[PDB]
């Protein structure tokens, strides 16, 4: 028995406490790097909350057992000056993750796929408490976003997945791949950076039109 609720500003600390327990330690890239204390990821996670489209799964006792943090993304302006997220980061491990994200964006722009769309929903952080996994909570979090999308005329939900494991979950939920890159092929300075276990494979950007 759990509820799916909009994350409020006063929920920030509780969301961060939950993420520190699970996501910071068990996202495949975070665990590969042994991220440790990372105020940069805390900042990254809190950023989308004021967009009012992030959701928490809450058990009967009132504890957060899952979150899907989402933000609105807008088509780059005609006069856009693109920035690398990695430039303003002092945490060497998180900088590797941000550099990977920057690289993906250099190679693939979701807005090229959907020329008529100005605003797309971006699924930024998805995490479920270990003891509540395999119960469909990820799907129920995701489905709550469809409500927001309907209410606001948003057609596309975009989710960068850090492993084939999570991409498979999104596939089950009706998303399809729009871009992929193997970790073995990511060599920004000529050498492999990420070498997690073979089943992870690489990143996949997943999309659904709702
Ligand atoms: C944008 C981003 O954040 S990408 C990164 C996504 N987040 C992570 O990788 C963090 C670590 N992983 C997690 O927190 C979770 O595994 C999630 C969020 C990916 C999935 O959440 P869940 O609510 O468990 O999803 P779901 O119920 O669909 O289970 C997914 C699969 O996990 C497997 N599974 C079954 N039981 C368990 C369990 N006890 N523990 C873990 N996995 C299980 C199954 O393969 C299951 O698929 P199936 O039910 O269709 O057969």
Curated annotation (Swiss-Prot):
Pathway noted in the entry: Aromatic compound metabolism; melatonin biosynthesis; melatonin from serotonin: step 1/2
Site (Might be involved in substrate binding): 44
Reported impact of residue 133 to A: Reduces catalytic activity
EC number: 2.3.1.87
Listed result of changing residue 161 to A: Does not affect catalytic activity
Positions bearing the site annotation: Acetyl-CoA: 172
GO biological process, one term: octopamine catabolic process
Phenotype upon loss of function: Has a darker body color. Shows ectopic pigmentation in the wing hinge, the posterior pupal case, leg joints and cuticular sutures. RNAi-mediated knockdown in astrocytes, does not affect numbers of astrocytes present in the brain. Shows normal baseline patterns and amounts of daytime and nighttime sleep, but while awake are less active. Upon overnight mechanical sleep deprivation, results in increased recovery sleep next day. RNAi-mediated knockdown in neurons results in normal patterns of baseline sleep. Shows lower levels of activity while awake during daytime.
Protein name: Arylalkylamine N-acetyltransferase 1
The encoding gene: speck
Part of the whole protein covered: 56 to 265 of 275
């Amino acid at each position: 028995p759990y509820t799916i609720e909009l994350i409020q500003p006063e929920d920030g600390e509780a969301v961060i406490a939950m993420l520190k327990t699970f996501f910071f330690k068990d996202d495949p890239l975070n665990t590969f790097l042994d991220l440790g204390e990372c105020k940069e990821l805390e900042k990254y996670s809190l950023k989308p909350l004021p967009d009012n489209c992030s959701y928490k799964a809450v058990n009967k006792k009132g504890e957060i057992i899952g979150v899907f943090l989402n933000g609105l993304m807008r088509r780059p302006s005609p006069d856009d000056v693109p920035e690398k997220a990695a430039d303003s980061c002092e945490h060497p491990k998180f900088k590797k993750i941000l550099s990977l994200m920057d690289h993906v964006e250099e190679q693939f722009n979701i807005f090229d796929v959907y020329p008529d769309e100005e605003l797309i929903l971006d699924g930024k952080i998805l995490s479920v408490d270990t003891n509540y996994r395999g119960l469909g909570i990820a799907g129920r979090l995701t489905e709550r976003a469809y409500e927001y999308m309907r209410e606001n005329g948003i057609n596309v939900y975009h989710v960068l997945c850090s492993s084939h494991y999570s991409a498979r979950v999104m596939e089950k939920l009706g998303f399809h791949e729009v871009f992929r890159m193997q970790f073995a092929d990511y060599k920004p300075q000529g050498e492999v950076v990420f070498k997690p276990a073979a089943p992870h494979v690489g990143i996949q950007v997943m999309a659904k039109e709702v």
